[PDB]
Design a protein around this ligand. Structure first.
Ligand SMILES: Nc1nc2c(ncn2[C@@H]2O[C@H](COP(=O)(O)OP(=O)(O)OP(=O)(O)O)[C@@H](O)[C@H]2O)c(=O)[nH]1
Ligand SMILES: Nc1nc2c(ncn2[C@@H]2O[C@H](COP(=O)(O)OP(=O)(O)OP(=O)(O)O)[C@@H](O)[C@H]2O)c(=O)[nH]1
Ligand SMILES: [Ca+2]
Ligand SMILES: [Ca+2]
Ligand SMILES: [Cl-]
Lengths: 164, 163
């Protein structure tokens, strides 16, 4: 049930406080610019922005390498811009159900919680994504850390992407 | 805060992930599709407009606060009539920027925080909503509770609808 897909979630760290700080006029411009940045970078990695969930986006890729490369590029771009917003990025892969312009299923929820575990400026991936990229000549991960994810039983090991 | 005055309602299913894990994707997708249909129908009955589906819920715009509250009341009633789904409902009003079929601004964020504060089966409204319904619209509230909302300074008094 469901087609295999790689799901990437983004989320701006403390976006409400930011909005309150800079005001709605500045916020609308900021988020408009951010939307364009993400959309552009996703299309460069042949991804698809499924929808804008909260202060971020749900993005679908066919291959985990594309998702990680996208996340790496986004974090680089946001760092360049600051010279400020920090974004969390989470990536998970598995089967999920398509419904119009949306994806449903436990693996969508899992991807969202992986992103929620990430610090601002960090890209976290689930164990299946890390394992799928175990032999990448360019992508590098840390040793991972164990967490429990809301709504799920057991423990999960999440891995941070180490970019050059 | 900028834009036009709008009443924003958020719905959010309580512990939807645990529910999904319990019944599986096949059953969950069937359940959420049914739920989407239910919410859409009830929103339209009160002249509301579903702006988008935020998480396992919806962001909905209404012109008047009584419309939003009546929608919430009817939704909670319908879910009770009904694999059990409990939903938090939060309602706030204020100026927000409406562009590209979306709503932006601090009052959107505030509405989301109000919904997050609500218990499953509860309809919580901000003080501006409560004050706007002081007239006999056939709606009653509790005495309110004072809480901190993430991202905002100070406290806010939120009122539960007594249906
Ligand atoms: N919770 C929720 N938020 C939504 C929804 N739709 C749009 N949003 C937006 O998502 C934002 C929610 O902020 P959060 O990400 O939960 O919290 P934050 O202020 O960024 O703080 P962090 O915990 O660091 O992320 C609001 O500003 C809303 O405008 C929705 O359906 N549910
Ligand atoms: N966090 C987050 N979730 C999203 C987003 N877009 C869609 N979702 C879905 O919304 C659901 C979020 O789960 P939560 O509402 O935070 O948690 P829950 O399991 O319902 O438990 P509660 O805290 O009681 O609501 C998941 O099923 C996600 O797949 C998004 O942009 N951010
Ligand atoms: Ca955020
Ligand atoms: Ca929920
Ligand atoms: Cl979590």
């Amino acid at each position: 049930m469901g087609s295999r897909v790689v799901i990437l979630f983004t989320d701006i760290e403390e976006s409400t406080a930011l909005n309150e700080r800079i005001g709605d006029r500045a916020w609308v411009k900021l988020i408009s610019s951010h939307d364009k940045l993400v959309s552009d970078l996703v299309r460069r990695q042949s991804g698809h922005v499924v929808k804008s969930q909260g202060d971020g986006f749900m993005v679908a890729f066919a291959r985990p390498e594309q998702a990680v490369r996208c996340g790496i590029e986004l974090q680089r771009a946001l760092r360049r811009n600051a010279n400020e917003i920090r974004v969390r990025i989470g990536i998970h892969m598995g089967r999920s159900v398509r419904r119009g312009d949306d994806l449903f299923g436990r693996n969508v929820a899992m991807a969202a919680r992986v992103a929620a575990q990430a610090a601002g400026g960090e890209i976290l991936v689930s164990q299946p994504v890390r394992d799928a990229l175990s032999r990448s000549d360019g992508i590098r991960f840390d040793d991972g850390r164990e967490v429990e994810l809301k709504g799920f039983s057991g423990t999960y090991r999440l891995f941070a992407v180490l970019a050059s």
